[PDB]
Design a protein around this ligand. Structure first.
Ligand SMILES: *[C@@H]1O[C@H](CO)[C@@H](O[C@@H]2O[C@H](CO)[C@@H](O)[C@H](O[C@H]3O[C@H](CO)[C@@H](O)[C@H](O)[C@@H]3O)[C@H]2NC(C)=O)[C@H](O)[C@H]1NC(C)=O
Ligand SMILES: *[C@@H]1O[C@H](CO)[C@@H](O[C@@H]2O[C@H](CO)[C@@H](O[C@@H]3O[C@H](CO)[C@@H](O)[C@H](O)[C@@H]3O)[C@H](O)[C@H]2NC(C)=O)[C@H](O)[C@H]1NC(C)=O
Ligand SMILES: *[C@@H]1O[C@H](CO)[C@@H](O[C@H]2O[C@H](CO)[C@@H](O)[C@H](O)[C@H]2NC(C)=O)[C@H](O)[C@H]1NC(C)=O
Ligand SMILES: *[C@@H]1O[C@H](CO)[C@@H](O[C@H]2O[C@H](CO)[C@@H](O)[C@H](O)[C@H]2NC(C)=O)[C@H](O)[C@H]1NC(C)=O
Ligand SMILES: CC(C)CCC[C@@H](C)[C@H]1CC[C@H]2[C@@H]3CC=C4C[C@@H](O)CC[C@]4(C)[C@H]3CC[C@]12C
Ligand SMILES: CC(C)CCC[C@@H](C)[C@H]1CC[C@H]2[C@@H]3CC=C4C[C@@H](O)CC[C@]4(C)[C@H]3CC[C@]12C
Ligand SMILES: *[C@@H]1O[C@H](CO)[C@@H](O)[C@H](O)[C@H]1NC(C)=O
Ligand SMILES: *[C@@H]1O[C@H](CO)[C@@H](O)[C@H](O)[C@H]1NC(C)=O
Ligand SMILES: *[C@@H]1O[C@H](CO)[C@@H](O)[C@H](O)[C@H]1NC(C)=O
Ligand SMILES: *[C@@H]1O[C@H](CO)[C@@H](O)[C@H](O)[C@H]1NC(C)=O
Ligand SMILES: *[C@@H]1O[C@H](CO)[C@@H](O)[C@H](O)[C@H]1NC(C)=O
Ligand SMILES: *[C@@H]1O[C@H](CO)[C@@H](O)[C@H](O)[C@H]1NC(C)=O
Ligand SMILES: *[C@@H]1O[C@H](CO)[C@@H](O)[C@H](O)[C@H]1NC(C)=O
Ligand SMILES: *[C@@H]1O[C@H](CO)[C@@H](O)[C@H](O)[C@H]1NC(C)=O
Ligand SMILES: *[C@@H]1O[C@H](CO)[C@@H](O)[C@H](O)[C@H]1NC(C)=O
Length: 1175
């Protein structure tokens, strides 16, 4: 056997040369084009080659394969068979078996006068199962900038009826203009004329060609791609018989309660036919004696108390204020905080983002019609050419801003981040104008002639939203849309308002300005914030009636909070003014107590300032929010104690010749145990609520506890002396409620029929509260912490309404992994031979779910890219022969050799020291137009290399994006499921011990890690505070366990009803809701204590009469003392300016006050009447 048509001497036209005829033996290859044999069909290299082939023939094949390579190279198993059909067809060693030249003519040589016979025509025998396996396996390849089949672009006609036999005929036909001579294919599967066609092994778009080349994608093949994944949605509601299954357990219980209760009443109604006294007695004596002492030594007492106030409150000179949200809302040692500490150290902190959500309301969508052919494509309003010009103008102007600072200018070019610098230094700007490179000329330049435009910016947009990483349009335009900074711009980051793939339909435009964030550096942060201030002002004052901008900045939340935290002290001052007005006129009724009310307010403010100052000395910084919510609470408690004491005296009648000290000592000894119990129960409650892990609640709790305690002490002391002085005064000229409570309310409430109704109603409300308890929301909106008139609220609305991607995620593989071994790479890979449970594959599956696991996009790993780069076929890597230095992809090719040898052993992955030998050059590679993307603009940051000792790799991350996250529920779900993925990877890696582990890092993790344990945090906090209250009460009130248990049960009822009100007004259970509940459990005592003690210490006959006696006596002071004061306070606060107050403090306080009032003054009377301790 032998080949024909050897060499290429003839010429058809242009460069087309008819191959020369030569029917001799197959020519041993010259050892010269060994590389070509490894590129065209490596199936020939088993050296004795004896190939009929010629290198000018190999290179003219390669020249013809440019467009087929461009289309079918997407799926290697396809372009592989196509090659099998051409290499064998041209210079296979048994060419004569399946070939027969027909037409040949002399070719005169202008060099030798020697006639060389050209091959004008011949037939090529192709199997039918071969043409069938080829077309059917390549028929699915889609084209770029379209959703057609690449055969639609390679048949020469519509892709709907290009059969498999005709297309090969057209490919071999010179009628297209590419084939140098037309070949008539014969598709016979059996040897005819003694001529048997070629039938080599064949591979479809599903099977892979080599142990390193992944199969074709289901984008370009329909058979490879199967059933989608699906998670099971568990609601986990019990729903016993149709309803919440908690609505029924309670309704069922309540009916049982009402029957077992009225079935005992209506059942009896027919039946008509040293251990305690020793500690409670020394306190009375001590307090009487001390009150007498303070009443007869007023000068010394008041002077020492003022000296104490100043000595303690002068530490307010060292006051520091914390405004950085991380320190406020993040525990200094939480798991997420430690992960953020680890990420900022090895990869540098996450950058600062300044978004811009532009929208064009004044415009309608328009249609784009392709000239040659194609369905109509509608474009959203903002993708209009005029709107694009105006947005480009806005962006180019946003780049000017300089915002001088510290006597020096600070330009964006200076503060923004440029990944690949100092080679390219423009910087990262993520706008849809980067597809055109921010150029009016590039945006307007058209490539058509009158009556039609060939290409347009519509065409460019459509091509690169499909392929945003190209370096040229390569389709009648030949322009890249990679971006001025170098690196792709993903269409989901620069657009919004479209529908699930149709970036044509985008209704909004997103524009991001990434800025470097610095780790332990303040001049740079000051510089960035100084630029951001001017950016904000500019964007705020830009008019442009054609656009509706929703903007933000990294420093905008902090600015918003410093503006709301100073806009309500103007609120707190009116509150104290109304408190003083009420206190001055109501404290007894020149029967006016204005002088005494002023003294009480000054003692209270003194207590506030003193608390703040002592803790400033200790070093706890102020949150300025506390400094605003603390005064209200302290005023409430102080006014209650003052009124109790002053009124028991006012209501006290003097024995025989008593001057002043004896009466005051007697009144204080009989009133102090109660005031002391209330003050201590609240101090302990508050201090104990200062145990959670949140610096804002921690410090607030501490501050408020100390202020209340110090205020109690200072009041009881300076104020009892000053009360003695003022009582002496006025006795030289220098009740209507009590009648009611005893006269018409106490008797009514305690009748024998009204009591069962009241108890039933209150137990019913408690049952309701227990039923709807577990339906309380969890978390904070993050949009309600802002005023109403702010632009951040609008920005959050715009996000929720338009954006499609969320915050980026980094799956940080900690330091300690190998990376220099087959298995060490398989654990990390998302590739050919490495495992199916690897990190990248697991993140890929998670992204495939995208609703269950809130991870939206593929990992975009660096090791997969590195391997693609190092593969010899790619050829991007190329070293100098003598220097072992990185030869760029654009080089004269003087002496640079390929990095990996092009052999079967070199095809494998670089497992040994070549990995770490070539990795740095990759990470230093730039985006070369001939090579590709390079590994500098995307992975230089993502890979850490330790110098020396073999240059072992450090910590690396694989960053993907979250899905649009709109609510606290969304954020907590994202955190949880990211943790799940990380734990799976950590498990699968099978680490010896816990030397290292994978963990995900996102910006909001520190702010949302508290809601993964907030429920157990609430349980612990509430239980501990209530047990502390219980113990303090059962100790201080004597030793009666019955009174203490009744009071504790009433406060627990109050808390449960607090949770009911939470559910009912839409308050969430965050660390603020939790602080207020743990506080309320401490304020309830202030109500529940007076009534129960007035009941306990009484020696009348029946339970009803004891109840009415306690009600009259103490409740006349309790309704006027605590209720009205706290009510005036809350009604002034109802008009807030910061949202969080007006929602949580106002609602929580109104609920607490009115709930405690009702419980105390009604349910305590009746419950004691029924089951109170006898004596
Ligand atoms: C989201 O974008 C897609 C396309 O990117 C929109 O699909 C197109 O819908 C518009 C609506 O008018 C059609 O103009 C267009 O269909 C055109 O071409 C067909 C081809 O025969 C023609 O018969 C029609 O008359 C029309 O000219 C749609 N494109 C196709 C065929 O896919 C989709 O509607 C967008 N979503 C929204 C909210 O509009
Ligand atoms: C992932 O996100 C959500 C899953 O919660 C899915 O949302 C897609 O589109 C909108 C979202 O607002 C919803 O639309 C659906 O439209 C059809 C129209 O016929 C309607 O019959 C459905 O009842 C539903 O309203 C829907 O949440 C969702 N659509 C579908 C078909 O799921 C999204 O689809 C999810 N991704 C995948 C791949 O399912
Ligand atoms: C077509 O099939 C033939 C089968 O002989 C291939 O020829 C080689 O087959 C093996 C590699 O595929 C070699 O190990 C054999 O040495 C060699 N067989 C012969 C001719 O003796 C041929 O390579 C196939 N086509 C391609 C893709 O090269
Ligand atoms: C971004 O980098 C490009 C080069 O990569 C810089 O060069 C540009 O300079 C002018 C912009 O002011 C344009 O007129 C040039 O066309 C453009 N270079 C090329 C190749 O055309 C440019 O200065 C950088 N920034 C901007 C804003 O373009
Ligand atoms: C417009 C489309 C159809 C063109 C793509 C098909 C082209 C690239 C195919 C069809 C026929 C093929 C040619 C058939 C014959 C020869 C002669 C041989 O000694 C070198 C390869 C060469 C030159 C082939 C190059 C690739 C080729 C030209
Ligand atoms: C209110 C009492 C307990 C004092 C505490 C005041 C401060 C610490 C509270 C009040 C409002 C709160 C903010 C509410 C909203 C947000 C936006 C969110 O994306 C980050 C947390 C952050 C920033 C919270 C941090 C904590 C916060 C600032
Ligand atoms: C090739 O693939 C096509 C795709 O539909 C299929 O119809 C055809 O049967 C396949 N060829 C076979 C099975 O021989
Ligand atoms: C703003 O930018 C324009 C264009 O880059 C430039 O001409 C001008 O000097 C810059 N500064 C201005 C306008 O103050
Ligand atoms: C910067 O400071 C120097 C010295 O204080 C001063 O002379 C100079 O004017 C300042 N820069 C500008 C722009 O004014
Ligand atoms: C895109 O198109 C050209 C072909 O004209 C290609 O060679 C190159 O990769 C890109 N253009 C340039 C000028 O490099
Ligand atoms: C809006 O766009 C038009 C486009 O012609 C322009 O003339 C106008 O100045 C822009 N701003 C407006 C109308 O406020
Ligand atoms: C996954 O793990 C290995 C590698 O593929 C294999 O033993 C197993 O069958 C695979 N199965 C799936 C579903 O990935
Ligand atoms: C490249 O280096 C090899 C290694 O010794 C050497 O044999 C070869 O001659 C060198 N070629 C050139 C062009 O420097
Ligand atoms: C390519 O590498 C050469 C090596 O010296 C360098 O001079 C040139 O600037 C590089 N071009 C790129 C990275 O685009
Ligand atoms: C984590 O892995 C388990 C099996 O080990 C699997 O059941 C679960 O779905 C995985 N979680 C994901 C993929 O979020």
């Amino acid at each position: 056997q032998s080949c024909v048509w050897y060499g290429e001497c003839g010429i058809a036209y242009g460069d087309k040369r008819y191959n020369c005829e030569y029917s001799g033996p197959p020519k041993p290859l010259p050892k010269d084009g060994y590389d070509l044999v490894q590129e065209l069909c490596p199936g020939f290299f088993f050296g004795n080659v004896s190939l009929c082939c010629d290198v000018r023939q190999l290179q003219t094949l390669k020249d013809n394969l440019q467009l087929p390579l461009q289309f079918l190279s997407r799926c290697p198993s396809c372009f592989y068979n196509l090659l099998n059909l051409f290499c064998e067809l041209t210079c296979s060693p048994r060419q004569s078996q399946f070939l027969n030249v027909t037409a040949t003519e002399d070719y005169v040589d202008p060099v030798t006068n020697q006639t060389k016979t050209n091959v004008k025509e011949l037939q090529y025998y192709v199997g039918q199962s071969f043409a069938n396996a080829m077309y059917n396996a390549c028929r699915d390849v889609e084209a770029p900038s379209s959703n057609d089949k690449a055969l639609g672009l390679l048949c020469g006609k519509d892709a709907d009826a290009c059969n498999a036999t005709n297309w090969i005929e057209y490919m071999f036909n010179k009628d297209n203009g590419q084939a140098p001579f037309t070949i008539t294919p014969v598709f016979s599967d059996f040897p005819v004329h003694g001529m048997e066609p070629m039938n080599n092994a064949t591979k479809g778009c599903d099977e892979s060609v080599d142990e390193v080349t992944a199969p074709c994608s289901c984008q370009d093949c329909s058979i490879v791609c199967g059933p989608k994944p699906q998670p099971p949605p568990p609601p986990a509601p019990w729903t016993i018989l149709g309803l919440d299954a908690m609505y029924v357990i309670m309704w069922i219980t309540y009916m049982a309660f009402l029957l077992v209760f009225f079935g005992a009443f209506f059942a009896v109604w027919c039946y008509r036919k040293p251990v305690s006294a020793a500690f409670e007695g020394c306190l009375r004596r001590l307090f009487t004696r001390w009150g007498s002492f303070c009443v007869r030594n007023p000068g010394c007492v008041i002077f020492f108390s003022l000296v104490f106030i100043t000595a303690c409150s002068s530490g307010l000179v060292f006051v520091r204020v914390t405004t950085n949200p991380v320190d406020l809302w993040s525990a200094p040692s939480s798991q997420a905080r430690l992960e953020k500490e680890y990420f900022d150290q090895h990869f540098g902190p996450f950058f600062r983002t300044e978004q811009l959500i532009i929208r064009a309301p004044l415009t309608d969508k328009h249609i784009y019609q392709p000239y040659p052919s194609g369905a109509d494509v509608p474009f959203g309003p903002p993708l209009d050419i005029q709107i694009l010009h105006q947005v480009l103008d806005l962006q180019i102007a946003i780049e000017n801003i300089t915002a001088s600072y510290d006597n020096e200018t600070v330009t964006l070019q200076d503060i923004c981040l440029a990944p690949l610098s100092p080679y390219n230094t423009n910087c990262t700007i993520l706008s849809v104008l980067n597809y055109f490179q921010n150029s009016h000329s590039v945006l307007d330049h058209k490539k058509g002639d009158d009556f039609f435009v060939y290409a347009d910016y519509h065409t460019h947009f459509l091509y690169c939203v499909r392929a945003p990483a190209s370096l040229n349009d390569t389709s009648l335009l030949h322009d890249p849309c990679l971006g001025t900074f170098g690196g792709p711009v993903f269409p989901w980051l620069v657009l919004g308002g479209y529908d699930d793939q149709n970036y044509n339909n985008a209704t909004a435009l997103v524009i991001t300005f990434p800025v470097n964030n610095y780790y332990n550096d303040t001049e740079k942060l000051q510089r960035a914030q100084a630029w951001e201030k001017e950016f904000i002002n500019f964007v705020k004052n830009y008019k442009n009636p054609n656009l509706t901008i929703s903007f933000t900045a990294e420093r905008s939340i902090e600015d918003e909070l410093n503006r709301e935290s100073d806009s309500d002290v103007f609120t707190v001052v009116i509150s104290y003014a109304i408190m003083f007005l009420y206190i001055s006129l109501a404290l007894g009724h020149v029967d006016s107590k204005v002088s005494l009310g002023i003294a009480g307010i000054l003692i209270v403010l003194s207590s506030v300032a003193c608390s703040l100052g002592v803790f400033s000395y200790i070093g706890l910084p102020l949150t300025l929010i506390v400094i605003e919510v603390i005064p209200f609470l302290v005023l409430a408690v102080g006014v209650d104690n003052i009124f109790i004491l002053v009124q028991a005296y006012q209501r006290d009648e003097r024995l025989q010749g008593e001057t002043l000290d004896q009466q005051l000592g007697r009144v204080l000894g009989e009133v102090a145990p109660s005031m002391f119990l209330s003050s201590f129960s609240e101090t302990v409650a508050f201090f104990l609520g200062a145990l959670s892990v949140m610096p804002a609640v921690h410090t607030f709790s501490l501050f408020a506890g100390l202020a209340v305690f110090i205020d109690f002490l200072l009041q009881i002391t300076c104020f009892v002396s000053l009360l003695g002085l003022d009582i002496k005064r006025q006795e030289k000229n220098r009740s209507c409620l009590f009648r009611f409570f005893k006269n018409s309310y106490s008797p009514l409430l305690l009748k024998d029929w009204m009591r069962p109704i009241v108890i039933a109603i209150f137990v019913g409300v408690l049952s309701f509260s227990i039923a709807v308890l577990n339906k309380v929301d969890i978390g904070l909106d993050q949009s309600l912490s802002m005023p109403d008139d702010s632009y951040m609220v609008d920005y959050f609305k715009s996000i929720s309404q338009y954006l499609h991607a969320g915050p980026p995620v980094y799956f940080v593989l900690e330091e300690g992994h190998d990376y220099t071994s087959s298995k060490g790479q398989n654990m990390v890979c998302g590739g050919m031979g490495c495992n199916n449970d690897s990190l990248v594959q697991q993140i890929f599956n998670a992204a495939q779910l995208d609703n269950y696991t809130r991870i939206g996009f593929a990992p975009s790993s660096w090791i997969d890219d590195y391997f693609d780069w190092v593969k010899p076929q790619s050829s991007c890597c190329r070293v100098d022969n003598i220097t072992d230095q990185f030869c760029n992809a654009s080089v004269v090719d003087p002496a640079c050799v390929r990095c990996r040898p092009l052999t079967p052993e070199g095809k494998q992955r670089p497992q040994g020291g070549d990995f770490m030998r070539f990795l740095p050059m990759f990470l230093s590679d730039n985006p070369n137009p001939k090579c590709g993307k390079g590994g500098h603009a995307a992975y230089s940051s993502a890979v850490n290399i330790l110098l020396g000792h073999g240059t072992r790799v450090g910590a690396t991350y694989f960053m993907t994006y979250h899905t649009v996250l709109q609510t606290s529920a969304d954020f907590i779900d994202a955190l949880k499921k990211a943790r799940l993925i990380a734990s799976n990877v950590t498990e699968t890696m099978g680490i010896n011990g816990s030397a290292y582990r994978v963990f995900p890092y996102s910006v909001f993790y520190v702010f949302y890690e508290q809601y993964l344990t907030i429920i157990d945090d609430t349980i612990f906090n509430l239980g501990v505070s209530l047990g502390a209250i219980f113990l303090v009460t059962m100790v201080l009130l004597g030793c009666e366990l019955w009174s203490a248990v009744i009071m504790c049960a009433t406060i627990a009822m109050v808390l449960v009803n607090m949770f009911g009100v939470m559910w009912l007004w839409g308050i969430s259970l965050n660390a603020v809701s939790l602080v207020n509940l743990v506080m309320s459990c401490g304020i309830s005592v202030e109500f529940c204590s007076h009534i129960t003690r007035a009941f306990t210490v009484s020696m009348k006959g029946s339970r009803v009469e004891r109840a009415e006696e306690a009600l009259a006596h103490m409740g006349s002071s309790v309704f006027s003392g605590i209720t009205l004061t706290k009510f005036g306070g809350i009604v002034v606060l109802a008009f807030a300016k910061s949202q969080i107050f007006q929602i949580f403090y106002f609602r929580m306080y109104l609920a607490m006050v009115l709930l405690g009032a009702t419980h105390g003054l009604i349910f305590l009377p009746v419950l004691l009447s029924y089951i109170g301790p006898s004596v």
